[PDB]
Every structure is written in C-alpha cells, then in structure tokens.
From a paper:
To assess the effect of the non-native His6-tag, crystallization was also subsequently conducted using protein without the tag, resulting in a third crystal form in space group P212121 and improved resolution (2.25 Å), with one dimer per asymmetric unit. Surprisingly, the two Zn2+ ions were only present in crystal form 1 and were both found to interact with the same chain (chain A), in a tetrahedral geometry, as is most common for Zn2+ coordination. However, the absence of other metal cations in the zinc-free crystal structures implies this is not a promiscuous site, and the tetrahedral ligand arrangement is strongly preferable for Zn2+ binding over other transition metal cations or the sodium and potassium present in the buffers used.
Here, we present the structural and functional elucidation of [name], a hypothetical protein from the genome of a thermophilic Candidate Phyla Radiation organism, identified through metagenomic sequencing. The function of [name] as a cysteine protease was predicted through remote structural similarity to the Homo sapiens vasohibins and subsequently confirmed experimentally with fluorescence-based activity assays. Furthermore, detailed structural and sequence alignment analysis enabled identification of a noncanonical cysteine-histidine-leucine(carbonyl) catalytic triad. In all crystal forms, the structure of [name] is a homodimer displaying a mixed αβ fold, with a central curved antiparallel β-sheet surrounded by short α-helices connected by flexible loops.
Author numbering:
A (entry chain BBB): -5 to 38, 44 to 216
B (entry chain AAA): -5 to 39, 45 to 215
Amino acid sequence: QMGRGSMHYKAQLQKLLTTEEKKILARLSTPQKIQDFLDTIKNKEHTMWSPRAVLKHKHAHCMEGAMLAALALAYHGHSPLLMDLQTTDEDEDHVVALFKIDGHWGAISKTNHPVLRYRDPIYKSVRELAMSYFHEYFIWWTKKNGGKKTLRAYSNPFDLTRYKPERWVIATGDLDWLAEALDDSKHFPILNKKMQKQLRPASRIETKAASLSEWPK
Amino acid sequence: QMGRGSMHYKAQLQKLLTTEEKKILARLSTPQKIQDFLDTIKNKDHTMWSPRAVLKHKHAHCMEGAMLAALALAYHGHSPLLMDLQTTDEDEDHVVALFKIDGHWGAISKTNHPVLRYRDPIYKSVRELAMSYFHEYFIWWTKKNGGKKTLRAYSNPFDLTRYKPERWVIATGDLDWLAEALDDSKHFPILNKKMQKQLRPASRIETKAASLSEWP
C-alpha cells in the first residue's frame, strides 16, 4: 500500500488513538467516505477542537472539519494537508483538507452553505483548485457591499507532519497556535490591484442561494 | 487603440445595425456593462434568435445571450468569442462569451440559476476558467441521478469572425447551423474514465440552491 514515512506516521497515530477512534478512521478509506462522514457532523463562543474532541462531540467549524479529514487521510497513507483560503477583513478565511488521486488535487470541506464545498480529484494544480472557489466567495449576509468577492489568496499545502501528532490529534487545549501557523505559511495572491478594480459583485440570486443553511435540519 | 481587422469588422456591423441597436451597443463598452445589460433581459425556459431578435423581444437562453454579448464585445474591438460547456446526454450544454482584460480570461453568461454565472477577468487560461464551472454543473431538477456532475468538456474559443456577420447578427432564420458548428469545434475533455468513477454527487443543499430562479 503506502510508503515507509506514511506507515511510520500511521503507527505514531495508532499509539495515540483508542480502538473506537481507529475503527472509525479504518472505515473512512477514501476521500469521498471522509466527506460523507463530515456530512453527518453538525456544523458550528470560540473553539479549535482536536480530531478527538470532534469525534466525541460530533460538532465542527471548517478548520476542525479539515483537521479531522487530514487525520483520516493520513490513517490511509495520504499527507495530512490543509489549504487556507484567505479573504479581505470583510470576511472570514476558510480551511479545506487537500488530497490527490492519480496526480489530481481534490479537497474535503466542512461548510454549512452551498459554496466552498468538496472538490473532486480532477484539478491539475493547487492554483486551479483554489480558483474554482473564487467566484462563490462573497458577502451574502448584508446589503453593505452585497455580493463583493472577498477571496485574495490561497496557502501552499500545509503538511501537519512537521508537528508531533500528540500536539493536535488528541490535544485538550485550543490549537490557536496551529491556526496561526497556517495563516502565517506561504500564501499566493489571486489578484493584483488592477484586477481587484475589475471585480463585479455576485448577483442577488447568488447571495440568496449562498445564504441557505444545512444545519439545523 | 483598436486594430485594423477589428475596425473593419465593426464597419461591417454598423452597415447591418439600426441607429437604436448601435446606441445600445455603444453604451455596453465594458464586459461588466454587457453582463449588467443581460441581467435586464428575461431568461427563457426550441429557438435560436439573432442578437437583433434578442434586442427586439428582450428574451434569451444562454447561446442567444452569449451571441449578443460577443456582438457587443466586437462593437468595442474584442474578438466575438464563444465557449461551449459540453455535458453528458443527461444535461444541456451551456455557452458563454469569453473576453480578456490585461492577459486574463473572463466570461459573460446568461442563466436563470445561481450557477454557471459571470466570471471576472482573473483566470490565467481558458482551462482554468472552464474548471471554475465544473463543481456547480450538476442535475438539480430531478432525483434521477440527483446531484450527478455532468460537465465533460470545454471548447476552444469559437471566433464568430470566420462568418459573414449578416449570417448571425441580423438573421431571421434559426441559427441551428451556428449551434452545430460550435458543438462540432475542438473540445478538451476534463476527465478520463478513472476520474469519472471518482466523482461525488453534489449535496442536497447544493441542488436546492441551484433550483432558485431569477425569472419570473
């Protein structure tokens, strides 16, 4: 199956996890199965729960969802990769878990709205995948700059392998240092100042569509 | 500063158009102003009207919208470019009008739903722009293959300059031959058979959101 580094990394994860947690991760053996699992978790004070906490309470915001996805991907031999989607100060950033199948990038995403969703493994580069989010990242919750497109940059794939898995997989603290390290990593701008002046606000039908909610119900 | 070919093409268009038609096209001097204008046209639920018919009756499906956009782009010196988005037989193709500003591709689009919309001129290649549509091209109107992602290929930019402008700008016929020529042009596949087997259906929240209607 997987390489030496991956099998070693999986072994370190198995030392930290309970039999129940491993039985769950063993079932999530494709990126599609992982997204299906996050679909059963209730979408979200302030928190930054570990994958352990998320599996216990079955509640997650986008980075909590992406860290659990990255864990499940690593348990089946993928790199635990996050990508930050970074907006203007008018909006909140969004995090996904990147994956590759046959040389093509996909993304697992935990969101409550019909935008910034899952991406199939069909995108030839990180850039191409990231640009598939741009048009649907906009102000939908106020008339003030209604429809303004707010995405400005995407991170390099952020490999959680650089940290001891104890520090995030089963942490009882808040992992704000991990969020901060992601936000501080290499990002690539999507626009220059000229391109920003060209931007057209999303239509009323688009802001109405974006406002629909998965949770509750 | 507009080129010789473009000025000549614009001259041919001016011979064919009424003063009212030219007054409209003169106003639509940016891609954004064109999309704003298509927003005031009623979306349709077979026809294949000319830009003349669309300006007269203020009604358009996607290719009628894109042909009017391409005309308005050409009236200000852009190439009148169409891109075909080609689906499985479970769905209908969608056509946009391509444009470039400072080396980056955008797209003008006439649709009734909050998917397959306008694209800002920020995309580094036709491929990159086309791939920005893939995830939001799915079956939302039936439970039969509910949520199936149906996009399979995108055309090369289709330059309408190859035809005598009389043939489409002011045609009174149906332009089924023009639709057929677009569908027959070079297309680039997005998937192979392996990748198609990977595809995941769109969620219920996505199919509900896609179902929303601008018109009536």
